[PDB]
Amino acid sequence: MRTHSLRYFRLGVSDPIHGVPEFISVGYVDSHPITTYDSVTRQKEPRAPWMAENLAPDHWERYTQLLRGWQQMFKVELKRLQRHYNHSGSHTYQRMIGCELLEDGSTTGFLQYAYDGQDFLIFNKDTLSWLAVDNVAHTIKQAWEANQHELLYQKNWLEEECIAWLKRFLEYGKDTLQRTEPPLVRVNRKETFPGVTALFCKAHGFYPPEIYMTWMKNGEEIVQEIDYGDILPSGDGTYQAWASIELNLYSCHVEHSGVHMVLQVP
Amino acid sequence: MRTHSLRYFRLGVSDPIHGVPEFISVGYVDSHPITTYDSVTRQKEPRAPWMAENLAPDHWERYTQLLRGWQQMFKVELKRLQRHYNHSGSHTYQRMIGCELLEDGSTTGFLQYAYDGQDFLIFNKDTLSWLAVDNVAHTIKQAWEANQHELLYQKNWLEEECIAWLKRFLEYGKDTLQRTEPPLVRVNRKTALFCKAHGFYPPEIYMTWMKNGEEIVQEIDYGDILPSGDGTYQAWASIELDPQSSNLYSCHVEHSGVHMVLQV
């Protein structure tokens, strides 16, 4: 197949002002949200139709009880982080865990933490060590690497448990995640500033969001000073992007789901 | 030294009668067998004592492996020959290879094949090519001559490797191969005059008759040189005597650098 992934995020805000919750937890398959929980509703709920249809109520009941506990874990860890930094006020604490299923059958896993939106700890599952960015992170790291069995548990989840859950969600929502919608690609030409011509290569309508676009001069070397647009969500489940150059014969090259396209500029 | 030679023979038979081997190979120095192998014993073993006493068992072990390989290559070649001739039943395939170290110091060298006891292919190490007797042989020639490297290998073996083995064996067997036992020559009658030699080694002996001092070719009856059974050879040569005029008949014998005459 193509490259798929599963990721769980956690956010903890100390002293949330007004509406902002104290704890949010959201899970994604690729760019699709699948599960959500937060300290206001205190319920683990589905965020994709094919998750609700294929998971029995007791799954949601059971992970609500865990997230309620993980909510409390996070609140406390954030408190000891601020104490270590001698920080008062409102600060944040984030965790990302997940795994990827590669096109060629190999796999990756990541488990990361962040404080005020910056890298704090990084797990290396192939050496079972935590990488720390500063002296505070080094303190937490020492406690975590003291517990040999938990480091082994973390590795087993990232290589086995996570990849099994991802394969399960893939099947549950295959009509969504494995579909392919090809890009609609056009080239626009326009004289902008006296003597400058701007060539724009626009794509839209495609899914999955991963697409390659580039400009080539005389068929061989890529042209320099290309400008790239972000791959933006269009709102209907598909995506758009572009690339532009200024200025021989030029051509746009688009590659998407194993189909190459070439748009020669007149 | 006298002329000495080393040769190796192989025989293959396609449909051998019960118990008769499919492959045999003997090596000779001069008239003496020195080695043997066959598809039944599956072992290369000496045929002469001075061979046995000078070559270590690793040597027999090595050439047994080789000869088991060459036995199979020989079966394959005979299969291919018999099919191209469209021949049924049992047929034979033969090979001879070897070399001569001459008295004056020059050398010779030969390799040739036979099918049903007839020449099939003869190698010429000067022009580096094979002579073909028929068109089955011609097809094999074209395939062998393509592999230029393999021809070059035969040339080097015949001119160097073979001559070096020959020198080595000549030393191991020197008490045998280089001795002389001169011959015992007599004349008698049966009407004809017989000249009979016996008890000589090496087996190379020349015996001609002479009428009044002139050599004869057509009148003379030559016998073969034969093994006696004791390591020595005997031969004879007769002539038929003129009943109407008298002549001075004399037997001449030449052997190992010694010429001798018997007047009658």
Next chain:
Amino acid sequence: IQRTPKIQVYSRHPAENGKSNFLNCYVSGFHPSDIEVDLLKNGERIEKVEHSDLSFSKDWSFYLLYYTEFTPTEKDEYACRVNHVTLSQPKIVKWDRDM
């Protein structure tokens, strides 16, 4: 370290004046997470406005998508207005009209 939102305003399909469409405000790259977003038509806030939940990036920032149905006219000016702790006053970003 705080990060201020990137604000991008674009249509779902290539815009034709007078053809039904969807207007999009994609707000991304910001941190912390508390943020206000509204869509404007000639300065007044639109009320039938869909939007995504708050979403998480691998680089610890957040992003959201706000959209509304509209028909692009030559007279109508559309925009997206966004407030965040990194901003002194709200930032109103105008739709470039697919130019």
Next chain:
Amino acid sequence: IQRTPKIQVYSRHPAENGKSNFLNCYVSGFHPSDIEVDLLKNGERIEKVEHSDLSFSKDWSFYLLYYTEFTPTEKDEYACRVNHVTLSQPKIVKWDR
């Protein structure tokens, strides 16, 4: 091509009656190689006759030596009996000193 054997019977030494000696039968020039050789005492096959191994010639024919120990007496007759694919009934050669 088939080649038919040349048979020769002779004694190791010039035989003197009563003196011990060796009687040889020497079969050569035949092709192919299957062959049967016997030594005869007054027509009876000598039980224990030794022989050499099959030998090769440069003209692709084979030779063999069959021999037995004996003592020549005036009243006794000795022969060699060879059998080959080139022979209808066995050939016989008598020793005629």
Next chain:
Amino acid sequence: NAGVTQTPKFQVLKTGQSMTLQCAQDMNHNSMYWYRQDPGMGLRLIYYSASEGTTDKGEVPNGYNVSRLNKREFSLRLESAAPSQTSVYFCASSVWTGEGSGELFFGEGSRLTVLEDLKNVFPPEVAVFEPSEAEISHTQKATLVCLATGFYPDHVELSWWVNGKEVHSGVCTDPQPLKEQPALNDSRYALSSRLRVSATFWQNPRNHFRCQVQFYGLSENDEWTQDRAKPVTQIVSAEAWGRA
């Protein structure tokens, strides 16, 4: 035509363990050989089979046996592995033995390491480092680097994957591994590798780079007793994305 096929390509063994290397040839050859290559020496023959139906000792047969199972196959068995049998083993074949001019055709080889115990076996850590901005500005070229460190024995295959497809143009991997502690006999290894691309290619944000190391280590049968994770055969990789 498949040539000479031998297996396995890599193997770790504990002292006294059994093993068997396989070799097949579809060239219809009659002679087959097992060699061992060792640093500083020329190939040494272990056993040979001059044709289907016979086998014999070579120069170093002690600690090995063989089996010319049929014409195609000739396998090499070690029954009680020794540290001295750590070596690279090659299988070869030729049409006939004793032809003089006939050349040898080799198999791809088998790398064997025999250890007293498996406490020394380590998979590699892999890390990808992104190009220097100074380099891109100076030379209009970008060089990523992949470091595989701390592994043992030297049974690794490192490759580079650009946009999901393996690549070879613009790559340089070391031909021999760095001993991390050169004095120690059991020292772990490090291996580096570079991919150099045009700066235009690096500066496309949609381009994805990945170096991956294949390690050959233990398997289910191998008895593991240490506190760290058992060092099985595995793939360890690291990725990077283009920066605008």
Next chain:
Amino acid sequence: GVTQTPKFQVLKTGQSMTLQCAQDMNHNSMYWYRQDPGMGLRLIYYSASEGTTDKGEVPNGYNVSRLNKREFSLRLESAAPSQTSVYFCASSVWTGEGSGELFFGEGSRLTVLEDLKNVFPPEVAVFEPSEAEISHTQKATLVCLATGFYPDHVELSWWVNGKEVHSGVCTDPQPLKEQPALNDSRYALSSRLRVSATFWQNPRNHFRCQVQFYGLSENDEWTQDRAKPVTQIVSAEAWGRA
């Protein structure tokens, strides 16, 4: 570590019971398990952390209250005989972490009956060593018998010369049923203390077998002619002979 009460309890059908569990480990998760013969621990209710609880495998007939981070109560609403079991409270540091183990409390042996009238303390009797054994082995075995009690709520100990003993002692792990055919059969337990023959023959040596029985409380009301079968010690004793 983890403390729960009571060790034993008798209940008439329909009564109410609350089991207490407390831990000073700063643990977040706590569990209520029951252990019945022939099957593994079955979870009744758990509390993943302070402020939440949820049901487990067999919740019918109970409810739980997580009062604070340290304490987790199990309430029996209306006791039934099928609720006779051994009850285990346990805690872990967090539910979610896959490696962490359970710490268990001492257990609550709890027996539920329809009529408290079958509750009987034991009769304890000591048996002096055989003179044949003393001569045949130079060791002396005396045996203690506790019979005809109900429910199975005993602990047997041997006390020599005023101080309890452990060497030379075997007590059966499970008592036997005196009327094995009946549901509510009474129980018999036995035990051995073997000592040197010279120790037994010294009459300055006093041997006492002691049975702790766990029966009715002072809150239960008792109307029978025979004495109220309350929690109590029952003993029998012997002295060194010659």
Next chain:
Amino acid sequence: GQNIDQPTEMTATEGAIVQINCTYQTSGFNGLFWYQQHAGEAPTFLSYNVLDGLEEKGRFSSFLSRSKGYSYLLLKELQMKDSASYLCAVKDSNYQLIWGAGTKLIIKPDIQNPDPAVYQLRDSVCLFTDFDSQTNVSQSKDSDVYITDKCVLDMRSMDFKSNSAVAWSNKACANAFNNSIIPEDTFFP
């Protein structure tokens, strides 16, 4: 998941080696635990395995095989004090434990000098003692005849271990243990 299976009972000789298997069929796997429970008491943690290998804590080692879905707990140099129940538990993919029903481990002691005999005590009770641990004891085939299972005692100071079973009745001593298979040399005074 659904099933976790371990043998009901296991018996072995003191000083020997016993291995206790736990095979599991579960949906997901986040670890495997071994707990020890002495009769009368509460379980205690012994061992946790989540990845393949063997781990040794003194005389006890525990082994996990992920592809085969089994663990075993292995005990070396069995002492009598290792008589207990061994409970095996697996955390499934939802972090719920699944408990096996436990394995009761019985340890026969190696009796140096067997001396089977059946004595009588007073102050109605017949004691069978001093036999070899090969002997198995049958229950009572009677309404008012009570026979107890065999029991090991260890006199610490004389360094002596012993077997014994007890029989008694309300209403007979030579015929006391006729249900069981007794040694042919059991001494009846």
Next chain:
Amino acid sequence: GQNIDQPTEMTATEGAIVQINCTYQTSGFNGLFWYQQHAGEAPTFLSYNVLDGLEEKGRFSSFLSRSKGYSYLLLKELQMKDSASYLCAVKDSNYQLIWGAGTKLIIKPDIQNPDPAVYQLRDSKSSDKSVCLFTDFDSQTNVSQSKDSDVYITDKCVLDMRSMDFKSNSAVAWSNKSDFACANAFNNSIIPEDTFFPSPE
């Protein structure tokens, strides 16, 4: 057959000629073979000589002198892909191959525009190493191992950007020592005087 000798290593330059010698002292002689062995791969037959003289095969010719007991393998117009080991073997009187130890042949690339520089590579979020790359030097330059035990320096490596038709040398040094900086990573090596060290941050 008891003795074959060839050199351990040879170094020549791209485009040059190089001549690998093999001297055999053997009992008997049925031919001398040359095999090529690229690193990590199987040997491949290059040539055979049994008689005196010289046989050509493209850029490779091989020479034999039976009397003098030596052969050589001649490689003309050297390319980078000729970096292998070259193995010599002799068939003795009993058709047993006798292998020389091999000759590893290293090829220096012709570097057209030297731009020697030491760059500092971006740190990885997942490692504690700092990584320096010494690159674009001429083949004359040798890279020597570290003196410090906590710094690791790999040897020179040649890469080919096939598209741009471009060749560069490079070596890598890395460490997690606090002191370690690129400006010092290759101090124990004799590097070009003109080597660019871009200013750090």
